Design a protein around this ligand. Structure first.
Ligand SMILES: NC(=O)c1ccc[n+]([C@@H]2O[C@H](COP(=O)([O-])OP(=O)([O-])OC[C@H]3O[C@@H](n4cnc5c(N)[nH+]cnc54)[C@H](O)[C@@H]3O)[C@@H](O)[C@H]2O)c1
Ligand SMILES: NC(=O)c1ccc[n+]([C@@H]2O[C@H](COP(=O)([O-])OP(=O)([O-])OC[C@H]3O[C@@H](n4cnc5c(N)[nH+]cnc54)[C@H](O)[C@@H]3O)[C@@H](O)[C@H]2O)c1
Ligand SMILES: OCc1c(F)c(F)c(F)c(F)c1F
Ligand SMILES: OCc1c(F)c(F)c(F)c(F)c1F
Ligand SMILES: [Zn+2]
Ligand SMILES: [Zn+2]
Ligand SMILES: [Zn+2]
Ligand SMILES: [Zn+2]
Lengths: 374, 374
């Protein structure tokens, strides 16, 4: 009945930086060839969504943000083969076109169709499916999950288990998979190792979960908000440190604590200074440091390349290094089989209409993940 | 007999920065416990030695530099078990104590006993075995090979094949092993891959040799001195490019040439700008860049961490990642077994007395390695 028709629905439109979202009617065009229109069920609030508001992340405005979500297919465009109406699906903010050199590479996941490197805020065809007040509205990362209905390219959606609890597994769409993969896949954390995790939000807690799953003997959480330490310990941190407690720089503190540097460190904040501090605190000859946090737009860090010459490895990743369409259904299956927990990341639940309250909770420091229900 | 006695011999003393070496008589103390006194046979001239002269590398002066050499044990101190008088040996500018957390680590080589990070210019015991005109003279990296005789700690020497041609295998002490291992061990170059090698001196040519040995399909040499290209092709470069020939930055040229970025890039120069160019020219999702070149003292580079967040790996290494005492004898055995060639690296052979002429050949661009013979 809605197939092939424009849908009027509520979305959270961001008209301007540093402003509340406006919950208002939008028009959602039907899907074109190899497009999928989804009725959203649940979306998380990730700090990257907040980066759009703050201008830390630059993407064209006005926009419908949101990238951490799950929903139910309303309709498919011509030529779609991988989902059907009524399927539970996760929009993939990192696409998997399956055809580019990255998709073909055994270790690549940052598909060349992404809209992250140089955001256009469109569908793959360079156009928008969203109208508000008669004006075209940008997409975000090909997902735009802050809407009762979105339209995504086929390469940006994965079918997931029909018995999935969508209010939980939406976290597999970003924060859990990112943090857990950054530990298990990107860093390849080893049994008995010492890890340091900078930033104890949803993503950093997910890194801790991955380090614990990998067998790390010591997992040191690092946050300037000590209110984050209890949850970090619950999911596997062996100890937590607040840089503000120490006269010396925290890289020196962590080097002392680890008797000469940690095996694996993770930047899970988004600061240039903590990206360098995290590199420095891993052991100089064999340490590995993984950048997870999103840096501020167009800003360069400064570092001494002797940190690398001695033997350190420095790397970053999007989405925990997971090939998105292959991995999201497997992660959902593994969650169904209790191979990892998502509840420790969910601190608050709100209706979608209380999105601004959700962002207030993240900005105050209170929440980890707020899950919004449509 | 010289054993147990001071030796007066000839050495190349560097009294201050940016001056010629002084070829003159020094006194060489006998070895103390766990020390080895070596009659030098051949030493290479590595750019790192020139860095001490130029002040690119800071180490206490006055100094007997030189770190790429081979010789014959003259005597051993109490408690030495791994070499004997008459043995061919290579001094190890990266030690292998065998006891430290790095030496115990399967992928560590930068032994904590090294004299690189925070150079003291002494033996392990914090004293010098060298005097000249009544003045104590510093060691360099535990090796000091620009002397007819040196004294090294046991952990800084490896016994090698008695039939070794020391005028060739001296290059296994630094430049060959560094470049080859940087490709085969540190980058882990894959069969069929595309490599970019920045700097086509002795070390960069050894990187090419390693990339070819690893089966790379394409090996692009990059140098501002086109006179370096012919020998780069001889040892495996498939293409060579001179940045000065192009209007665009060379990272853009190399990304275009490799249809979206190289698999593996290597900085083998020692410039901050080429370290960032080399990182940028590797494919953004799965590329690997290795820093080999020694950066100038205390200078930071500037870079955009989005280069790593997309999926790049950035690493560095000393001595090609090789655990020095285990590896050197095996590398010399492999050379003896015709597994790789060293002659392509040797452009000049001079008496030791012509050390300054050897440095002038390096600085002018003419030479790859000059071997000095005692
Ligand atoms: N690479 C990816 O694919 C990916 C995915 C998801 C999130 N991100 C980014 O990862 C970062 C973390 O996201 P999140 O967990 O949702 O955010 P969050 O909940 O804001 O957590 C960040 C944590 O960092 C802490 N913090 C802030 N400053 C400092 C400091 N100077 N030192 C130590 N701790 C500090 C802060 O108190 C908070 O608990 C953000 O930059 C995201 O944009 C990246
Ligand atoms: N990591 C290690 O363990 C290790 C070992 C040995 C040498 N090194 C360092 O490796 C570097 C190379 O040593 P080497 O091969 O003996 O030196 P080299 O023979 O002087 O070779 C350097 C090459 O770089 C070329 N070059 C200079 N500037 C540029 C530029 N802007 N762009 C492109 N090419 C340029 C130059 O023409 C020359 O052919 C030096 O910095 C050494 O100190 C490090
Ligand atoms: O949180 C995931 C995430 C990222 F990791 C980014 F690098 C990015 F630009 C972005 F928009 C995003 F949502
Ligand atoms: O060429 C080898 C070499 C290095 F790689 C250094 F980092 C250094 F400091 C040095 F003195 C040296 F000789
Ligand atoms: Zn792709
Ligand atoms: Zn996110
Ligand atoms: Zn050691
Ligand atoms: Zn050298």
């Amino acid at each position: 009945s809605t197939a092939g028709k424009v849908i009027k629905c509520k979305a959270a439109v961001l008209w301007e930086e540093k402003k509340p979202f406006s919950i208002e009617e939008v028009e959602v065009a039907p899907p074109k060839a190899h497009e999928v229109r989804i009725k959203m069920v649940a979306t998380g609030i990730c700090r990257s969504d907040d980066h759009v508001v703050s201008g830390t992340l630059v993407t064209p405005l006005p926009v419908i943000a949101g990238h951490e979500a799950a929903g139910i297919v309303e309709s498919i465009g011509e030529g779609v083969t991988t989902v059907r109406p009524g399927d539970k699906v996760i929009p993939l903010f990192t696409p998997q076109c399956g055809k580019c050199r990255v998709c073909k590479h055994p270790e690549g996941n940052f598909c060349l169709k992404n809209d992250l490197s140089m955001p256009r805020g469109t569908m793959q065809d360079g156009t928008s499916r969203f109208t508000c007040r008669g004006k075209p509205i940008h997409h975000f990362l090909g997902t735009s999950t802050f809407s009762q209905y979105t339209v995504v390219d086929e390469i940006s959606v994965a079918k997931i288990d029909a018995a999935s609890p969508l209010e939980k597994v939406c976290l597999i769409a970003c924060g859990f998979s990112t943090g857990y993969g950054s530990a298990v896949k990107v860093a390849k954390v080893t049994q008995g190792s010492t890890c340091a995790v900078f930033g104890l939000g949803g993503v950093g807690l997910s890194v801790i979960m991955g380090c614990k799953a990998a067998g790390a003997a010591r997992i040191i959480g690092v946050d300037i908000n000590k209110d984050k330490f209890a949850k970090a310990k619950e999911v596997g941190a062996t100890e937590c440190v607040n840089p503000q407690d120490y006269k010396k720089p925290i890289q020196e503190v962590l080097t002392e604590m680890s008797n000469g540097g940690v095996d694996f460190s993770f930047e899970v904040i988004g600061r240039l200074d903590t990206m360098v501090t995290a590199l420095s605190c891993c052991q100089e000859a064999y340490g590995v440091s993984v950048i997870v946090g999103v840096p501020p737009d167009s800003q360069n860090l400064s570092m001494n390349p002797m940190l690398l010459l001695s033997g350190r490895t420095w790397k970053g990743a999007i989405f925990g290094g997971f090939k998105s369409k292959d991995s999201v259904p497997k992660l959902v299956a593994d969650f169904m089989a209790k191979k990892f927990a998502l509840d420790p990341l969910i601190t608050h639940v709100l209706p979608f209409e209380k999105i601004n309250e959700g962002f207030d909770l993240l900005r105050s420091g209170e929440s980890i993940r707020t899950i919004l229900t449509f």
